[PDB]
Amino acid sequence: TETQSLELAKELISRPSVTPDDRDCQKLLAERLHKIGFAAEELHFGDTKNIWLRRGTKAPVVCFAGHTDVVPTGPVEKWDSPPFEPAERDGRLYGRGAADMKTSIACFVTACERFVAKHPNHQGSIALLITSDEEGDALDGTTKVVDVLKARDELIDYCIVGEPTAVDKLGDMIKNGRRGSLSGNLTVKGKQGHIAYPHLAINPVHTFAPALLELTQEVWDEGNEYFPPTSFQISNINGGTGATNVIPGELNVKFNFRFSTESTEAGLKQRVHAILDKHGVQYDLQWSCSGQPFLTQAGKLTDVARAAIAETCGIEAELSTTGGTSDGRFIKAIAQELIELGPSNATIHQINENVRLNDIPKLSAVYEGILARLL
Amino acid sequence: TETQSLELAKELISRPSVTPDDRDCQKLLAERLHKIGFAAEELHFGDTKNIWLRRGTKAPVVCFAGHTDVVPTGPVEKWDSPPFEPAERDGRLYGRGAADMKTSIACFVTACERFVAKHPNHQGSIALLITSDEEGDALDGTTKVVDVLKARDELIDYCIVGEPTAVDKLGDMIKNGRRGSLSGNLTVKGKQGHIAYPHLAINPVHTFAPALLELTQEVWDEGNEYFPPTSFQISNINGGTGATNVIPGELNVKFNFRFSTESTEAGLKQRVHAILDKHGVQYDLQWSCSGQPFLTQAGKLTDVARAAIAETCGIEAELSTTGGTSDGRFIKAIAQELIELGPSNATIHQINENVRLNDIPKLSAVYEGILARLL
Numbered sequence: 001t002e003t004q005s006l007e008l009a010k011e012l013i014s015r016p017s018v019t020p021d022d023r024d025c026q027k028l029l030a031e032r033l034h035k036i037g038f039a040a041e042e043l044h045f046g047d048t049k050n051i052w053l054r055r056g057t058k059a060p061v062v063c064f065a066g067h068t069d070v071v072p073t074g075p076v077e078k079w080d081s082p083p084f085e086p087a088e089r090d091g092r093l094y095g096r097g098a099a100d101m102k103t104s105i106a107c108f109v110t111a112c113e114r115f116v117a118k119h120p121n122h123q124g125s126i127a128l129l130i131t132s133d134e135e136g137d138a139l140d141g142t143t144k145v146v147d148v149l150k151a152r153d154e155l156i157d158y159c160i161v162g163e164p165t166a167v168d169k170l171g172d173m174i175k176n177g178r179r180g181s182l183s184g185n186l187t188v189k190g191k192q193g194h195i196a197y198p199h200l201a202i203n204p205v206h207t208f209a210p211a212l213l214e215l216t217q218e219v220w221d222e223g224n225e226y227f228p229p230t231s232f233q234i235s236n237i238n239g240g241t242g243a244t245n246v247i248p249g250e251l252n253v254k255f256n257f258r259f260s261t262e263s264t265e266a267g268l269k270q271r272v273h274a275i276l277d278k279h280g281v282q283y284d285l286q287w288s289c290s291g292q293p294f295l296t297q298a299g300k301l302t303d304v305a306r307a308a309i310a311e312t313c314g315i316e317a318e319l320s321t322t323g324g325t326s327d328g329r330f331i332k333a334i335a336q337e338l339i340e341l342g343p344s345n346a347t348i349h350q351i352n353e354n355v356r357l358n359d360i361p362k363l364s365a366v367y368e369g370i371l372a373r374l375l
Numbered sequence: 376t377e378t379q380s381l382e383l384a385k386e387l388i389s390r391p392s393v394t395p396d397d398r399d400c401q402k403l404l405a406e407r408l409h410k411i412g413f414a415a416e417e418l419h420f421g422d423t424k425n426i427w428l429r430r431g432t433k434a435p436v437v438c439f440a441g442h443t444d445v446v447p448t449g450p451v452e453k454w455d456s457p458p459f460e461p462a463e464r465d466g467r468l469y470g471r472g473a474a475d476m477k478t479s480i481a482c483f484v485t486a487c488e489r490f491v492a493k494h495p496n497h498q499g500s501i502a503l504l505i506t507s508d509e510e511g512d513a514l515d516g517t518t519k520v521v522d523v524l525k526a527r528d529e530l531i532d533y534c535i536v537g538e539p540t541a542v543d544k545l546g547d548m549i550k551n552g553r554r555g556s557l558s559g560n561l562t563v564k565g566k567q568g569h570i571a572y573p574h575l576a577i578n579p580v581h582t583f584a585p586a587l588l589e590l591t592q593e594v595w596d597e598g599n600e601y602f603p604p605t606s607f608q609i610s611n612i613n614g615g616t617g618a619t620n621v622i623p624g625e626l627n628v629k630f631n632f633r634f635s636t637e638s639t640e641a642g643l644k645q646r647v648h649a650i651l652d653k654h655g656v657q658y659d660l661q662w663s664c665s666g667q668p669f670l671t672q673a674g675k676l677t678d679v680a681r682a683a684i685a686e687t688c689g690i691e692a693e694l695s696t697t698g699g700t701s702d703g704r705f706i707k708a709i710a711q712e713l714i715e716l717g718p719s720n721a722t723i724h725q726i727n728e729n730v731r732l733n734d735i736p737k738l739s740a741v742y743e744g745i746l747a748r749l750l
């Protein structure tokens with residue numbers, strides 16, 4: 001079985017492409033796939049590099065999407081082997097980006113090579129949408145490329161985002177969508193004063209308390225067959241001057257919803273304002289929504305991914321929308337069906353990040369099985 | 376009517392005796408009262424100066440207590456006239472310490488002079504207990520002097536603390552005691568994690584929420600004829616890393632009780648622990664109690680103060696235990712009866728601090744009336 005995915009994953013990992021830097025990872029990919037008919041189109045915005053590689057000119061268009069940037073390593077001596085010197089050890093490949101998400105990219109590229117070699121007259125088109133900023137604020141990465149593609153009507157039928165999705169074994173989980181994310185920055189207003197004269201002050205911690213309990217106990221929805229219940233979480237709360245004999249004048253609270261399609265952005269905001277208003281809270285509230293939920297319901301793409309996983313890995317993949325998010329939240333606008341599929345995400349963003357070596361050629365063969373079933 | 380109190384209040388105020396500095400205010404007082412039979416005893420501890428002046432050697436011993444230190448002025452150009460250049464204007468005397476509490480000290484000293492002159496063979500003893508640190512952490516001020524006096528069995532029958540006690544008119548309020556103060560530093564423990572996986576974290580804001588509501592709604596006691604209900608107030612709350620996609624690992628809350636004699640220190644602590652435990656909160660809690668409540672019930676001293684106020688000011692003084700505290704919390708240990716009595720506290724610790732000029736010789740004549748009724 002092929003070793004080409006492994007060695008390409010190594011050369012990618014060896015590049016310290018901390019966001020938003022690419023270190024010519026995109027150039028490497030472009031030059032390699034150019035050899036088998038992929039045209040390259042660079043789309044740079046701000047400090048972020050993006051590439052849209054494409055072979056073929058007609059439908060169906062199957063897209064692989066991913067990112068070449070990695071999160072910072074932390075103090076390097078805490079690693080067992082250096083984070084940008086990929087090492088084989090105990091049946092694993094260790095390095096920053098080994099799981100998120102350079103190995104996926106390497107597996108897909110080799111899958112393209114093997115597919116195109118076995119089927120040089122295949123129908124449709126194969127594309128790669130690669131960015132150097134998914135891990136940061138992501139203002140100039142995939143979202144810009146999607147807008148360019150949508151503006152010139154270059155649409156996608158099937159997209160696979162190579163993010164790591166597995167719980168333990170490769171293939172046990174595919175993502176067919178993600179929660180939206182809605183964030184609030186609440187400033188509860190009181191009136192500062194000496195703690196010994198509470199009747200001349202208004203303690204914003206005390207005024208907020210009944211709403212906070214109602215917020216943290218609230219059932220937002222029950223989820224459905226594809227999504228878990230909408231989740232509300234407080235991330236920060238800060239109030240006071242540091243003196244233990246003063247009642248603060250204001251209290252700042254930061255909170256977030258990861259919400260399913262059972263609830264809407266507008267609905268959540270109205271509910272939050274209603275809870276605060278019914279308890280007489282005086283406040284300012286700034287909202288920000290960094291994404292809507294998206295979903296690809298059971299269909300050809302999910303069926304095909306399951307079948308390829310059953311063939312290669314021997315297991316039944318489960319569909320999931322849990323966890324964080326991905327660039328799928330931008331791409332779904334131009335992709336009719338989109339899934340995410342990759343290796344274990346157990347060690348992402350952590351020190352001694354790794355992937356099982358046996359999963360590497362399996363992942364690539366899954367991607368190749370997907371290509372064959374769609375094209 | 377005499378102008379001696381005014382001019383002595385001026386020379387005191389003109390000294391910038393920001394805690395714990397005295398600027399020889401205590402030396403001035405000692406040298407002045409030495410002329411009429413007061414022996415001086417310096418009791419210095421750390422950076423704090425204390426003086427125990429006394430005329431007479433037998434009971435009853437009447438004590439005036441007070442402090443020569445003042446709080447910082449703030450940026451001086453914000454004042455209408457300089458804070459340490461005492462100015463007469465619009466029937467008021469302006470300056471740092473004009474209300475808290477140099478004018479009281481000046482009024483009592485002149486009262487001693489007039490009393491002793493009119494009654495050179497009076498019974499009992501007159502004492503002044505003066506410190507240069509009441510406004511700060513007060514570890515080396517009156518509390519040390521009291522321990523020295525108590526150790527050599529030098530006890531006090533009647534004490535008047537010159538803190539400003541008036542609401543509007545001089546004499547409308549006397550303090551016959553104060554609340555205790557019990558402070559808690561609570562650390563609620565959770566488990567930090569990414570906000571999108573709440574089932575792998577424990578949000579300490581959410582775990583604390585039901586206890587916080589129960590704490591801020593709790594009726595601690597109903598007070599009694601002398602005290603208002605025990606008061607619980609949150610001063611600080613802080614939790615989070617600053618990232619809006621992280622659930623904090625811990626939450627810090629600082630709170631305080633100003634409590635009456637209806638509740639005990641131990642009882643309050645047990646109640647707080649019981650509320651937190653019944654909601655399953657996991658926490659560390661450090662307590663500190665900076666004073667017990669103290670009370671002088673209606674008696675000769677309150678009766679005498681009321682009667683002197685009725686004579687000089689023409690109004691009926693009300694007894695109160697509200698507000699902050701004073702060095703009475705130390706002195707009550709050796710004083711059988713103690714009250715506080717001074718001018719308006721409306722402008723204490725603020726810029727353009729002042730006292731009505733007409734209240735100055737009235738305050739002094741009240742103190743003199745107290746001396747005459749007790750000695």
Ligand SMILES: [Zn+2]
Binds near residue numbers: 164
């Ligand atoms: Zn990723």
Ligand SMILES: [Zn+2]
Binds near residue numbers: 100135348349
């Ligand atoms: Zn990532």
Ligand SMILES: [Zn+2]
Binds near residue numbers: 442475476509538539
């Ligand atoms: Zn004072």
Ligand SMILES: [Zn+2]
Binds near residue numbers: 446475510723724
């Ligand atoms: Zn003060």
